[PDB]
C-alpha cells in the first residue's frame, strides 16, 4: 500500500485558488500535509483525524483549508496563492499517531505559482538518432531527446518503445538548463538518453518515441495574446530503427 497524489505538477497564477488531492492508505486514521519550498526544509502544515483537524502549524493560515469529502480522498485547498506557495506539497498517512507509527509519504505535487502567465511556453521536442560510429565501436545505440524553449521548468520526459513506456537504458537530466541564464523568465532545455543494443536499433520495425508532459495553463486561465494558449500538453518526437 502507498499514498497517491495526482498531478505530479501544477502551474497557477498568483491570487488563484488551488486544490491538491491525495489518496491516503485506505486503513489509516491520521492524514497529514507537509510542504517543501526549494532549498528549504520539509515543513508541517496540518494533520487530520476522525473528520476534524488534529494539529496545524502557523503556515496553515486563513488561506488554507483541509477537506475529507469521503472515505477515500483527502484534499488541501489554498484559497489565494502567493509567490511563496511554490513548493512540493506532500500528503502523508499513518495507521495511528503513536511514537512507533510510521508516516507514509505520497510522491508529492509540485506547485509553481507565477506572477504573470505571459511568459509560459510549451517545449519543442527533437529525437537524435544513434551515431553509426558508436554502433560499430560498442554494438550499443544511444538516442538523445532534447526538450527546448519551455517555461516554467518542471516537465516530465518519458521514452516509449513499441508503444510501451521504458525505464531500462534511460537517464534524464535531473534539472533543466537555462537557455538565457541572465534573464529571470529564461526558457529551459532538458535532455535524456535511451540506450539500446545495436541489433535492437537496426530492426526497422522497432519504434522509438520521446514524450514531454508540459504543465501550463488550464481551461479556466484567461488568454488575450495572439499566440496559442500555452495549455498543459504533451509534445513528442519519434524515430524508427534503421538497418542502414
Amino acid at each position: 500500500p502507498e499514498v497517491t497524489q495526482t498531478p505530479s505538477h501544477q502551474v497557477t497564477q498568483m491570487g488563484q485558488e488551488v486544490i491538491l488531492r491525495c489518496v491516503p492508505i485506505s486503513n489509516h486514521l491520521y492524514f497529514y500535509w507537509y510542504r517543501q519550498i526549494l532549498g528549504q526544509k520539509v515543513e508541517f502544515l496540518v494533520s487530520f483525524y476522525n473528520n476534524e483537524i488534529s494539529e496545524k502549524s502557523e503556515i496553515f493560515d486563513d488561506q488554507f483549508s483541509v477537506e475529507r469529502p469521503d472515505g477515500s480522498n483527502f484534499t488541501l485547498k489554498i484559497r489565494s496563492t502567493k509567490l511563496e506557495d511554490s513548493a512540493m506539497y506532500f500528503c502523508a498517512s499513518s495507521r495511528l499517531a503513536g511514537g512507533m507509527d510510521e508516516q507514509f509519504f505520497g510522491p508529492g505535487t509540485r506547485l509553481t505559482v507565477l506572477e504573470d502567465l505571459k511568459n509560459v511556453f510549451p517545449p519543442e521536442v527533437a529525437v537524435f538518432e544513434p551515431s553509426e560510429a558508436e554502433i560499430s565501436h560498442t554494438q550499443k545505440a544511444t538516442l538523445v531527446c532534447l526538450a527546448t524553449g519551455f517555461y516554467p521548468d518542471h516537465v516530465e520526459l518519458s521514452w516509449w518503445v513499441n508503444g510501451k513506456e521504458v525505464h531500462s537504458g534511460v537517464c534524464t537530466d535531473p534539472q533543466p538548463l537555462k537557455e538565457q541564464p541572465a534573464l529571470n523568465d529564461s526558457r529551459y532545455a532538458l535532455s535524456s538518453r535511451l540506450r539500446v543494443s545495436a541489433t535492437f536499433w537496426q530492426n526497422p520495425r522497432n519504434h522509438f518515441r520521446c514524450q514531454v508532459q508540459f504543465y501550463g495553463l488550464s481551461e479556466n486561465d484567461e488568454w488575450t495574446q495572439d499566440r496559442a494558449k500555452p495549455v498543459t500538453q504533451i509534445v513528442s518526437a519519434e524515430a524508427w530503427g534503421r538497418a542502414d
Binding site: 510510521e102 538518432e129 560498442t138
Partner: protein, 200 residues
C-alpha cells in the same frame, strides 16, 4: 525547533560504505524517523526509532538512536545505485507533527566496467540540419565542466543502466547554435581521458 544533518552532501563509489548524522532536541523526544528520498519518487520510510541505544536495519541501511545526547547515525553498507538519494531525518515530540532536518544528499558513483570514453555526433531523426554531441562511456573519475561560452549548452552527467545486458554508462550532451561548433571541441573545458575516441 532545530534538526541538524551533516555532512549535507556526500559522494561515495558503488560498493563503498558511508555514514552521516542527524541531531535533534533531547527535550520532549518521542520518535525519530529516517527516510530515503530518491529523485521524483515518494520519500521512502526506512525506520522509526523510539528506544535509546536502539539500532534498526532495512537491508544494507542501518541507524542508531541516542535520546540523551540527541543524535542518530545512519550507515549505508556497500552502497548501490538506488542509494543515491536525499536522506531525511525527522523528530516527533508529543504532537502529531514531524520536524525535519535539511537532509544528507548521497551520490553513489557507478562502477564503470571497461570504460571506452568517446565523443559522438548524433543527427536529428527529422529532416533538419540539427545535431548533438554525446560524451559517453567514461568512468566516474571524469567531471563534465560547464561551457565557458554562453551559446554552448552542456548537460551534467547522468548514469543509465541497460538491464538487457547488465551494463551501466555515464554520458553528457552538448549542443550549440553556433554554425562553426564541432564535437571535437565541445568538451574542451573538461579534463577528459587521453584515449577519448573522436571518430573520423
Amino acid at each position: 525547533l532545530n534538526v541538524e544533518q551533516s555532512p549535507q552532501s556526500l559522494h561515495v563509489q558503488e560498493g563503498d560504505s558511508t555514514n552521516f548524522t542527524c541531531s535533534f532536541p533531547s527535550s520532549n523526544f518521542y520518535a525519530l524517523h529516517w527516510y530515503r528520498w530518491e529523485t521524483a519518487k515518494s520519500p521512502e520510510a526506512l525506520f522509526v526509532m523510539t528506544l535509546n541505544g536502539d539500532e534498526k536495519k532495512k537491508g544494507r541501511i542501518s541507524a542508531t538512536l541516542n535520546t540523551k545526547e540527541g543524535y542518530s547515525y545512519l550507515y549505508i553498507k556497500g552502497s548501490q545505485p538506488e542509494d543515491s538519494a536525499t536522506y531525511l531525518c525527522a523528530f516527533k515530540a508529543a504532537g502529531n507533527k514531524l520536524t525535519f532536518g535539511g537532509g544528507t544528499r548521497v551520490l553513489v558513483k557507478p562502477n564503470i566496467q571497461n570504460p571506452d570514453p568517446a565523443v559522438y555526433q548524433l543527427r536529428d531523426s527529422k529532416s533538419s540540419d540539427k545535431s548533438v554531441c554525446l560524451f559517453t562511456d567514461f568512468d566516474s573519475q571524469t567531471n563534465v565542466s560547464q561551457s565557458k561560452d554562453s551559446d554552448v549548452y552542456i548537460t551534467d552527467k547522468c548514469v543509465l543502466d541497460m538491464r538487457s545486458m547488465d551494463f551501466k554508462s555515464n554520458s553528457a550532451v552538448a549542443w550549440s547554435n553556433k554554425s562553426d561548433f564541432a564535437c571535437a571541441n565541445a568538451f574542451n573545458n573538461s579534463i577528459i581521458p587521453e584515449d577519448t575516441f573522436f571518430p573520423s
